[PDB]
């Protein structure tokens, strides 16, 4: 049956932590998709799929957008899409982590912050998670498609301007975290996070950053990064997750957006079209049979 489509989502989850087995069992009930979802350790929020047949498949990864800054009118930094074609062998296990949006600073359910949103530290949006599609070979994870998330918007961001998409296809380059300042940089592919507000690398579990203690100790405006890798927010915006996490400003500059992450496509696979910011919310993965 080559007409089959498997659609991977957040299974209903949002924020810096990913979903449970019971959420995905609910979201995927009465479909062709069945998955195993880790409960603990670095694989906790990650969905495990079994490839049904040896064949060529389309795999399109979409990462998550970063949050809004200090004004309801701002546009978000949309997550990056990465479309590839891959040959897979029956019974391969694919591990899938669907990125979750960075926390918005606006709108707010607090009517005292909502005043600000409609017209000091803490207005910047959170970083937002990348989407990861990888596989195990010899016990070490191997990446196939990583669709970076979008950096968070600064509290006082004035222009809806964003930088061109970055795509790597070279494992020898290290997939490190982005720089953190007052705001958390984005989680990369393999690193050692130690700050509370920086996004975690995938192999650490990819939990999204806490917001900055400068914000949370005094004013209480919370903007966390998203599953997986989303950097925490301050006045500055947080960096988005990727193979390499997007950078956050070195100071708490309120005009400085977090950078998007760097995406990744295995060179053994075939890229279909350049990477492109399209996603306005959470991420997504789509898998179909390919006609050749």
């Amino acid at each position, epitope marked *: 049956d080559p007409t089959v489509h498997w659609l991977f989502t957040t299974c209903g989850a949002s924020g810096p932590h990913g979903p449970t087995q019971a959420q995905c069992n609910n979201a995927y009930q009465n479909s062709n998709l069945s998955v195993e979802v880790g409960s603990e350790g670095p694989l906790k929020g990650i969905q495990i799929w079994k490839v049904p047949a040896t064949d060529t498949y389309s795999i399109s990864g979409y990462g998550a957008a970063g949050g809004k800054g200090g004004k309801n009118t701002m546009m978000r930094s949309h997550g990056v899409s990465v479309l590839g074609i891959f040959n897979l062998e029956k019974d391969d296990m694919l591990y899938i982590l669907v990125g979750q949006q960075g926390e918005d600073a606006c709108p707010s359910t607090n009517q005292l912050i909502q005043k600000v949103c409609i017209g000091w530290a803490g207005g910047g949006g959170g970083g937002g998670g990348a989407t990861y599609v990888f596989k195990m070979k010899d016990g070490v994870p191997v990446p196939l498609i990583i669709a970076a998330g979008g950096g968070g918007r600064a509290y006082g961001a004035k222009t809806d301007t964003f930088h061109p998409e970055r795509l790597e296809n070279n494992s020898s380059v290290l997939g490190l975290n982005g720089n953190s300042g007052a705001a958390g940089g984005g989680g990369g592919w393999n690193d050692n996070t130690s700050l509370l507000w920086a996004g975690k690398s995938l192999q650490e579990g990819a939990t999204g950053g806490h917001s900055c*203690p400068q914000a*949370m*100790k005094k004013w*209480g405006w919370e903007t966390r990064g998203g599953f997986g890798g989303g950097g925490g927010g301050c006045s500055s915006g947080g960096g988005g997750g990727g193979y390499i996490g997007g950078n956050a400003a070195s100071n708490n500059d309120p005009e400085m957006d977090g950078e998007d992450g760097v995406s990744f496509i295995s060179p053994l696979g075939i890229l279909y079209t350049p990477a492109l910011k399209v996603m306005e919310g959470h991420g997504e993965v789509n898998i179909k049979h390919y006609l050749n």
Partner: antibody
Framework: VQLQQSGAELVKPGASVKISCKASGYAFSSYWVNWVKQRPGKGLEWIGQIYPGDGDTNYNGKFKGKATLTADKSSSTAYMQLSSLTSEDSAVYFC??????????????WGQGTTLTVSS | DIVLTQSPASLAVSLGQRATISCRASESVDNYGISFMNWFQQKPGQPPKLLIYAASNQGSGVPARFSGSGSGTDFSLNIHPMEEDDTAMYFCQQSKEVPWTFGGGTKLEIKR
């Protein structure tokens, strides 16, 4: 969002207790945890607070060295240890989370309370 | 300390009637354009529950009959119309300056 406290304690004068407050459903390291004492026929008393992220503390001078506040990030648990107990320490003790300036720096989520009784 | 003088200590009210509780502070509790006066309800055997934060703002799921007023050193909690389920202790509270302090409380009881 839940704070869940440990059970009651009945102890002799001179002893110590350590009351636990286990947090869930939010980022333990980003909010202040407050402690409050309530006795019959009295109001509420603020004992102090702790910020688990970096161990910062603020005390009510009336309770310094009587209450000792700590936080354990591994378990997301806030403790209060009461030393050199007397009959004036017999009370119900609450832990409570507070939010920042935008929320009036006020409490928004309370443990169920812990009853201490001190008698010889 | 910032001392809160809550009045009255006891108050009896018929169903439907207006109940007014006052809290006066020894110094202004305004800072950054916010008033750090807050109001709480506590029934027997329960922890306290937030009614009003920053002097004027409804807490989540707090019915409309509760409302807070004031700024600086004078503040007020109004309940109207009074319902049976409002009998409880009521406390004011400031967070402007350490140490955080409570008013002395008001016990709200039914009149007969």
């Amino acid at each position: 969002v839940q704070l869940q406290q440990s059970g009651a304690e009945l102890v002799k004068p001179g002893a110590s207790v350590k009351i636990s407050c286990k947090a869930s459903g939010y980022a333990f390291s980003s909010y202040w945890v407050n402690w409050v004492k309530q006795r019959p026929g009295k109001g509420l008393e603020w004992i102090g607070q702790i910020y688990p992220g970096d161990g910062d503390t603020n005390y009510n001078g009336k309770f310094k060295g009587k209450a000792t506040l700590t936080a354990d990030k591994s378990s997301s648990t806030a403790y209060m240890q009461l030393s050199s107990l007397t009959s004036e320490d017999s009370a119900v003790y609450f832990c409570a989370r507070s939010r920042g300036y935008f929320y009036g720096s006020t409490y928004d989520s309370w443990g169920q309370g812990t009853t201490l009784t001190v008698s010889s | 300390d910032i001392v809160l003088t809550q009045s009255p200590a006891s108050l009896a009210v018929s169903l439907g009637q207006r109940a007014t509780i006052s809290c006066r502070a020894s110094e202004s509790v305004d800072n950054y354009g916010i008033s750090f006066m807050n109001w709480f309800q506590q029934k027997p055997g329960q922890p306290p529950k937030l009614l009003i934060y920053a002097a004027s703002n409804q807490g989540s799921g707090v019915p409309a009959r509760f409302s807070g007023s004031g700024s600086g050193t004078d503040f007020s909690l109004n309940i109207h119309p009074m319902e049976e389920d409002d009998t409880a202790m009521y406390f004011c509270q400031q967070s402007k300056e350490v140490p955080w302090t409570f008013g002395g409380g008001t016990k709200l009881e039914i009149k007969r």
